[model samples]
Target: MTYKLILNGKTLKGEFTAEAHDAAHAEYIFRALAKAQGVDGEWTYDDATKTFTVTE
Candidate 1:
């Protein structure tokens, strides 16, 4: 599925595109994304829209 994510690096803000087979997989990726950016964040999946978003 196609997913959109937002990242707040504290110093900067970014928008990203992410793809995953399922929501669980996407959450895994979101965690990694937050870790990579050295920040804590939240992720949400919308089944109807087939979209996922992560905010930090």
Candidate 2:
């Protein structure tokens, strides 16, 4: 499965991509990316859409 992550901020917008076998793996990938980028905010995942959003 493919996952798309959108990072939304007041004045900045960026995206990250990852591939996983399932939602659990997808979430692990997302958390790793967020930690690498030092993302400190709320995040949500849409199982139906296979998308994630991180807001700061």
Candidate 3:
């Protein structure tokens, strides 16, 4: 899905190309990636925009 991922780690606003079959799956994937950098992440989703805006 084409989602916007806002991660407040060493990185900035952006969403790299990825795949998530489900909503929960997508959360796990993004959170896992953020945690790998020893950072906690925030997850957000609004059907109106059809985008997941995640941050930390």
Candidate 4:
């Protein structure tokens, strides 16, 4: 599955695959994204809503 994530008003392409289905697995990806994007503050994942947000 795939999802279009809106981050800082920009649409980010996200894939909701086996990795995304597992928080632990997806966390590594998030960390890499955060590092690459120079994100600061919190990283939130909403299971029910099926979304991840980064606040920099």
Candidate closest to the true structure, highest lDDT: 2
Q: Number of backbone collisions per candidate, in order?
A: 0, 0, 1, 0
Please give the TM-score that candidate 1 achieves against the real structure: 0.65
Every model's TM-score: 0.65, 0.81, 0.59, 0.54
Instruction: Please write out the lDDT profile of model 4 over residues 1-56, one tens digit for every residue.
Output: 33223344234433333346566556666667656765545667776755666654
How well does candidate 3 score on lDDT at residue 30? 69
Q: What tens digits encode model 3's per-residue C-alpha lDDT throughout 1-56?
A: 64445566555555654577766677677677666766666667765655666566
> Could you give the candidate ranking by lDDT, starting with the highest?
2, 1, 3, 4
Q: What is each predicted model's overall lDDT from 0 to 1?
A: 0.68, 0.82, 0.62, 0.53
- TM-score-wise, the better of 2 and 3 is 2
Q: In candidate 2, residue 20 scores what lDDT?
A: 93
Flag regions of model 4 displaced more than 4 Å.
Answer: 1-6, 9-21
Residue 29 shift from truth in candidate 2, angstroms: 0.6
The local lDDT score (0 to 100) that residue 26 gets in candidate 4 is 65
Name the 10 consecutive residues with the lowest summed lDDT in model 4. Answer: 1-10
Clashing pairs in 4: none
Model 2 collision count: 0
Which window of 10 residues has the lowest lDDT sum in candidate 2?
8-17
